[PDB]
Design a protein around this ligand. Structure first.
Ligand SMILES: Nc1ncnc2c1ncn2[C@@H]1O[C@H](COP(=O)(O)OP(=O)(O)OP(=O)(O)O)[C@@H](O)[C@H]1O
Ligand SMILES: Nc1ncnc2c1ncn2[C@@H]1O[C@H](COP(=O)(O)OP(=O)(O)OP(=O)(O)O)[C@@H](O)[C@H]1O
Ligand SMILES: Cc1cn([C@H]2C[C@H](O)[C@@H](COP(=O)(O)OP(=O)(O)OP(=O)(O)O)O2)c(=O)[nH]c1=O
Ligand SMILES: [Mg+2]
Ligand SMILES: [Mg+2]
Ligand SMILES: [Mn+2]
Ligand SMILES: [Mn+2]
Ligand SMILES: [Mn+2]
Ligand SMILES: [Mn+2]
Lengths: 683, 289, 289, 683
């Protein structure tokens, strides 16, 4: 066993009844003085390194050609001047195993952390040396972390796409289904997770040109997509991951759910395609009143009204659907469907739950389209227009397929540096650059939506780490007050940066004029309610930083009205799974699953303590499963009120609790304004 | 948590000797040397003799002392496979490859063999020591059973798998592979029943049961090494067979919920080629907060 | 002279309830009166109890005491059928036709029913009284087993057969016919083993064994009458079922080599209506014509 | 039990030790007296019938509008003047259950046999009343039978395409694979059987964008295609049928074959995807000499030579591939592979066998392309060019995808009417019309090849029926003499009609000038070898008909040289599954499987004796399984020497014969010039 492995395992060997957390630090030293420094490839100077990486097809030469070598040297020197040290063994291990650039045979390390950060910063700046240094300082301080696609692939010749998630709308036609399968394979080839809205597809037993009971429903398309994602599995490196979203009022909703039952037959079971359910407020109202609900056949509704079932408001059209004899429907028990959802989530963690009305009551771009589904991580909530892929030799009507670039603020590092504004603006600029340089030649709706919406996702990580390292319980009202203030600041500065980009470029996102940003409605709660901290401890935490007031929000509203906004969507809180290790941060705004996690790598086992875990903050690092899910819902709703897109909200459940407890948590989330629920992980 | 699942896997693996035609093995059997034929015969007789103990005593005695209708049914099914399927299959292989007089002599030899007898009687001794309503003695017998199913058979299985991986004696090798696949699931199942007993014990009693299991494993392992040299030195395979024994000993321990005893080793590639949460209804007022 | 042919017959009769889809009975079940459904559930529950004990206890214990690996293989196979196939099939039927509460209630009903407890007490008592190397205690248990196989099941079998014969509950009925086909051969086989032991005795001892068999039959019969009335009076069939059980009592006696005890009667005619390719290598001459 | 069914089951009841065959005739009468006439919708006049069928969207207005009502009435009167009577119950049952037009509620019969024949004739003639009457006389004499798609769908508004055999070339790209899946779905939606060539696809473990061990091979593509064919199942009417062809020198050939093994796992086995193997002469030579063969990685060959492995002649390329270090290959035993093919055919009848050199040594259009694969029925053998389907908003390079037009001559009816020439020419004209009226808007290469090649398949059926009713054993040399003469006349008149159509329209098929028809090579064996019958009995059979001599063939060769040929391909012998029942004929040129076949429809049993079966010809109606497969191969080769495309050739084996016998039959077929082997049906 390696020396650093033994040093890391020495953490759990208690001394005087206490964990040896400091041993972890020793491990990193070993991991660098025995493996990383020996396995790294050193050159005489930076010129030889850059030339070797360029000619050997490791780096794209275009982004490096925008800078003179003196500027690149200055950027690299700025990166190395911080003398960044990984405080935990797992941070360095995760970076050098998942994100550091290696040779073709993967026998040596070509990229250090500073090298990777410098390359990403130079790609972000697009020829601006000062901007590149700003990005270097932002990432080496670990205030901002680009998503895994962006951080791993920026400036690389053998790179994939920098966009993490893609959302596709599938129209009710064989041509559209085949095009959706093709685009899903193309985007999984690019490495991104693909989500498909199957609510427009007509249910099982519908007519294909006057021959009835002909359609296979959404389950056949689900099987096709599952095989497509199995085939396109990132060249066999990462398993192809897809998501299917169906409205709960679709007739196939049961069969949909039956794809995830552990007793499902092979002709129905789907195993590589995640499932999500979109629940309008009408379904929750029907379940609450115990009135029997009706699921609908989408094609009959489309024939009668000319629009898809998910294209209009069910809260106002459900009674018209039920009373219409030309609309076909089936009777269901909404409470039984809710119990089935809870049982499925207990068994397998599926489906994702999207509260459609919670998303669309604060959605700023309802004029473009209502949000009808979410992404594979159930945090992207954007307007999408379905595409009409016609026959060959016929022009296709290209719609809008959602796609946003992810980037997370490290809350602990951002607040320690007292740089919410600067970090938010620089992250917005980096995400705007990632969107601008993204061009996908096989997904036309994705390309058009990227060019028009200009949507980005600016997330946050290390919420629980910051709260526990500052002596604040994650479930406490003080923690929710901190989240309210911090994310109001993040939203304020993201809107300010979006408006500044719109002013400097003279262009807004497409159809911005009909948005609530243009009409000023979006700023209502910000121009009437003060989001400054209500607790003295939180206010002290925010000292040295100008917390925006109602007057600052009014000025920002006027600025947006004058100049517009460059981005249709700005903030989305992704799960941030593996890149949180490198940043020494807790995953996303979720509470920690465990204080010390035991992970098996190779034939060895390693223990990763939570960042900053110690004796004095052991009980502030409360495990998520031990927490009240209602207070976690309260925290997520408090954050969500300042996030325009959704938050990947994983439910952390105990084995003792029943499906009724899961249903109660889901209904409280819906009541509190939670937009989406990601996972039901049971301990 | 597991008996119905094992029921399903067991019954869907049902097979009969008649399904595999054996006569075509004579086309490769005739080309083996005397030492190869001798080792094969001796190994086969070893497996036959041990499996008979499992059919007549091992499985039925465990079925007798285990509580639970569904467990008794699965255990009955496993006992049936030993007596009705496996025993007939071994007999069929023998009758195909050797004349009656040769079969009788091989069984006379293996019946007198010191290393085969040592392990056979050690296992049988633990089955005979089970006492009514004593879960400790039952556990010890289950450990013995898992060691037979998941470990002791494998010094024997090695040779048919070795031929099977080379394209020799393919019909009997197919039969052996089906038998081995049954013994694997038998070992896993009995292992889960043993862990159930183990988990009901105090910490001191657990440590004592662990010591029992490791001590028993050691005794059997040291005899397996001698058994192995006795049979396989004449065909030059003992080194590789020993690696296969240790690898299968580790599987047997894992079946009993214990850590592996031996370091990980690679296996001969020819042999490798041969080888619900509680549903509670919504009560209303759960929609109001 | 017979074990091999019974071995072959038993293994060729192998089946699983899952081979028969049961959803086809859903409507003819729905259409029965509450009295009819109640009697049907209880009848099958009584059968389940008998097979539970025949599989857990009766067949394994007889297997233990009977000499010869082939005889043991047949008895082990029969034991597996009892609890892994027969007893389980009834749950397949219950799970299709009845809600969980009705299923729970009928299993509670078997525990408290005095006739079902009495018959289990008597039969299992005799199984557990077998003494090693004591052929007389073994004979007594084999008589009990024949009476279970060939007599006691029939108060239960009547009703599924009665429906099958009217074209009702035909999928459940198909399962029951397969069970009945098995029990018929089980009763014959155990009967032949019992006769072996009986034939070894003095004339005086034989006279006592006939007394035992007839006294036991009468005691079981009197209890079965009360059980039959208790179940069938609510569906109007008690007298008809009684004729059927007497008919089958005579078959049980005959399986034991004894003369019929009850006079012949006309049975309900409805119930009577209820009854790879071979591979050669390519030669170089096969490529030229 | 209905009266006609009792009269049909009375056949098996033996009177005086003989089957009551004549009782079948009585059954037909009952089937018409009790059922057909009662459930047949009658109209006061044909005008009312046509108006009702057109208005209720049963027929098409376009093809009926080309004639005056007087001409349509005259065509219908010509059809009804024959007073055609079905000779067997199964003929009428199959027509009125499969082909007769029924109401939307499927309880009444709108079309009789004469009505359907008249409608198909009017569709064929395209406005010519005399041509329509000629077609009516052709089909009511039952001399020619349009295929099931053409016969069922001609003149019907609610219909699929008239072509049901489609051959697709799949290029080695994700875009091409997705396009192939889409086209397969679209063609299965049209009701056609789709065959895909997977030899150009790179094997498992190949590089994608210079990353190693990334390709899933052709098995993942087969899984995708199998899912696509399961999804597209003719609106839930028939099981989606597809075929995949792989060259035997493709490395995936074993895994390909492993998709049909019973022991294959769920992630390996494809259930609704037929498989065929293309066997070049090089593989047979390697197996014959027992030299170990090499299966090649297609992408390495493409990188080294710039052409696909299946696009070059393996006979001259195999040694260069083996000796090339940059071509990756795996060692195999060709005899073991042949034994595996025989074993798989014994177990399941798969794969289809295509002898590439047997096809291409007589292929007339090798300049366009060599025949690389066959159809789902393994009788279509045409040149195909792969298409380069690029990314979106990029022009695709459309190639040639085979789609031939099926139609079968009834040999008994054709020869008893002494009308080989007239029937062949009229069938060629009808096939040309159906090919010209086919327009598929979702298969670009299929449409392009249909427009360019103008390929049709004119088959024959009732060969064994005709031979048995004329006292000729199917295995006799006289039967082969008759087949030789009859199919040489069929080829002669097909070529003459193609040249006449080319002269009339002034156009040939695309790239005809490079064909062997243009160079006169095709006619070589016809201008030197006389194909007149060598037996007096066969000559008397051909009495009253002019048999083309060598001088006639020289004149035809000169005519083709002067005027060209309209069709790239003319003749292909399809299995003719259900149309053989309606025509009261034996299926294809295959020998009969059973003298009397027992079928179960609903809960009733029915008995179909072979047409013309009696006590006198009971011995001549020998069953196929009892026949020597070598003599069946000899007859099929005798026919194949006059057929430009292939013949659906099913092997009929007994359970006693082993895989050595199957391999011997396959090798004798290869030796005798058999192009394709369809199925290995074991009795
Ligand atoms: N935790 C760590 N994170 C990142 N790099 C590390 C870490 N530990 C060691 N290294 C690398 O290994 C080298 C070993 O030097 P070390 O940290 O022991 O101190 P040093 O030799 O006094 O110099 P310095 O600390 O100034 O780099 C470091 O210079 C650095 O490049
Ligand atoms: N074998 C058959 N094949 C086809 N149609 C038949 C057959 N038998 C009877 N029919 C149909 O039933 C009708 C009655 O025929 P039948 O044998 O009674 O005498 P017919 O002289 O042909 O009668 P019609 O006056 O109808 O022409 C036929 O006209 C035809 O429509
Ligand atoms: C072709 C086909 C379609 N479908 C379903 C899936 C599609 O969502 C739906 C629409 O198919 P379409 O491609 O729209 O079929 P269509 O346009 O010819 O019919 P229509 O005019 O009614 O739109 O039909 C199947 O389930 N199986 C099939 O094989
Ligand atoms: Mg459509
Ligand atoms: Mg390519
Ligand atoms: Mn065994
Ligand atoms: Mn075993
Ligand atoms: Mn039983
Ligand atoms: Mn029994």
């Amino acid at each position: 066993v390696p020396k650093w492995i033994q040093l890391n395992n020495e953490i759990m060997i208690q001394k005087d009844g206490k964990f040896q957390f400091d041993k972890d630090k020793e491990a990193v030293h070993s991991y660098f003085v025995d493996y990383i420094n020996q396995n790294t490839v050193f050159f005489h100077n930076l010129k030889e390194k850059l030339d070797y990486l360029v000619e050997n097809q490791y780096y794209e030469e275009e982004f490096l050609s925008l800078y003179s070598f003196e500027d690149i040297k200055e950027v690299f020197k700025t990166a190395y001047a911080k003398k960044f040290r990984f405080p935990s063994f797992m941070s360095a291990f995760k970076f050098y195993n998942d994100y550091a650039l290696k040779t073709n045979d993967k026998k040596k390390i070509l990229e250090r952390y500073e090298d990777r950060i410098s390359i990403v910063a130079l790609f972000f700046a697009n020829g601006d040396t000062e901007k590149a240094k700003e990005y270097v300082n932002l990432m080496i301080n670990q205030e901002y972390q680009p998503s895994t696609p962006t951080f791993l692939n920026a400036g690389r010749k053998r790179r994939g796409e920098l966009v993490s998630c893609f959302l596709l709308e599938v129209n009710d036609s064989l041509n559209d289904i085949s095009r959706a399968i093709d685009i899903s394979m193309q985007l999984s080839k690019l490495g991104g997770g693909v989500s498909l809205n199957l609510s427009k597809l007509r249910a099982k037993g519908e007519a294909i040109k006057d021959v009835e009971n002909a359609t296979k429903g959404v389950v056949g398309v689900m099987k096709l997509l599952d095989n497509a994602f199995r085939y396109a599995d990132q060249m066999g490196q990462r398993q192809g991951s897809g998501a299917a979203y169906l409205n709960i009022f679709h007739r196939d909703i049961n069969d949909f759910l039956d794809t995830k039952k552990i007793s499902a037959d092979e002709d129905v079971r789907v195993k590589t395609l995640s499932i999500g359910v979109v629940i309008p407020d009408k379904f929750v109202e029907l379940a609450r009143e115990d009135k029997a609900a009706y699921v609908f056949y989408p094609h009959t509704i489309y024939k009668e009204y000319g629009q898809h079932m998910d294209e209009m408001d069910m809260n106002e059209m459900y009674d018209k659907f039920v009373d219409n004899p030309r609309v076909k429907k089936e009777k269901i028990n909404p409470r039984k469907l809710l119990e089935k959802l809870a049982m499925l989530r207990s068994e397998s963690g599926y489906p994702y739950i999207m509260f459609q009305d919670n998303v669309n009551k604060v959605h700023a771009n309802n004029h473009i389209s209502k949000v009808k589904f979410s992404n594979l991580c159930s945090e992207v909530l954007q307007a999408s227009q379905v595409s009409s892929y016609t026959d060959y030799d016929e022009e296709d009507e290209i719609g809008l397929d959602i796609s946003c670039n992810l980037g997370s603020l490290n809350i602990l590092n951002v607040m320690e540096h007292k740089s919410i504004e600067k970090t938010v603006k620089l992250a917005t600029d980096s995400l705007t650059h990632v969107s601008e340089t993204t061009d996908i030649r096989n997904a036309p709706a994705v390309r058009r939506a990227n060019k028009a919406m200009k949507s980005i996702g600016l997330g946050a990580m290390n919420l629980h780490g910051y709260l526990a390292q500052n002596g604040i319980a994650y479930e406490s009202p003080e923690a929710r007050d901190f989240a309210n203030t911090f994310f109001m600041m993040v939203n304020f500065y993201s809107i300010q940066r979006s408006a500044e980009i719109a002013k400097e470029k003279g262009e807004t996102f497409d159809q911005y004029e009909g948005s609530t940003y243009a009409t000023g409605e979006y700023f209502d709660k910000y121009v009437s309610t003060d989001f400054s901290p209500k607790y003295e401890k939180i206010a002290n935490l925010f000292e040295g930083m100008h917390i925006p007031t109602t007057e600052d929000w009014k000025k920002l509203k006027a600025f947006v009205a004058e100049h517009g906004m460059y981005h249709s969507y700005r903030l989305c809180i992704a799960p941030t799974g593996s890149i949180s290790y490198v940043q020494s941060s807790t995953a996303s705004v979720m509470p920690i699953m465990e204080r010390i996690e035991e992970r098996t790598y190779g034939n060895s086992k390693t223990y990763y303590p939570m960042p900053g875990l110690a004796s004095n903050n052991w009980f502030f690092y409360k495990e998520a499963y031990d927490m009240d899910m209602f207070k976690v819902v309260d925290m997520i709703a408090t954050i969500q009120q300042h996030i325009d897109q959704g938050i990947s909200f994983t439910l952390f459940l105990k084995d003792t609790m029943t499906t009724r407890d899961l249903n109660r948590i889901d209904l409280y989330a819906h009541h509190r304004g939670i937009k989406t629920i990601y996972y039901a992980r049971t301990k | 948590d597991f008996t119905q699942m094992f029921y399903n896997q067991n019954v869907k693996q049902f097979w009969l000797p008649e399904e595999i035609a054996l006569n075509g093995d004579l086309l490769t059997w005739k080309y083996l040397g005397k030492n190869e034929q001798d080792t094969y015969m001796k190994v086969l007789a070893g497996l036959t003799l041990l499996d008979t103990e499992q059919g007549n005593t091992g499985m039925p005695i465990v079925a007798e002392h285990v509580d639970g209708h569904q467990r008794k049914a699965v255990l009955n099914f496993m006992a049936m496979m030993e007596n009705a399927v496996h025993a007939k299959s071994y007999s069929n292989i023998f009758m195909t490859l050797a004349p009656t007089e040769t079969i009788n002599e091989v069984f006379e030899w293996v019946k007198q063999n010191k290393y085969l007898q040592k392990k056979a009687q050690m296992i049988v001794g633990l089955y005979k020591a089970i006492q009514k309503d004593d879960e400790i003695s039952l556990f010890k017998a289950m450990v013995a059973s898992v060691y037979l199913e998941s470990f002791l058979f494998y010094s024997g299985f090695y040779y048919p798998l070795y031929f099977y991986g080379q394209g020799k004696l393919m019909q009997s090798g197919e039969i052996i592979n089906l038998i081995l696949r049954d013994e694997a699931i038998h070992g896993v199942y009995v292992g889960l029943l043993a862990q159930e007993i183990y988990n009901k014990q105090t910490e001191e009693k657990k440590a004592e049961l662990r010591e029992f299991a490791i001590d028993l494993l050691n005794q059997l392992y040291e005899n397996e090494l001698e058994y192995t040299e006795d049979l396989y030195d004449q065909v030059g395979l003992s080194h590789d067979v020993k690696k296969f024994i240790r690898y299968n000993a580790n599987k047997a321990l894992m079946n009993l919920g214990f850590d592996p005893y031996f370091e990980e080793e690679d296996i001969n590639p020819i042999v490798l080629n041969g080888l619900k949460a509680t549903v509670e209804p919504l009560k209303d007022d759960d929609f109001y907060f």
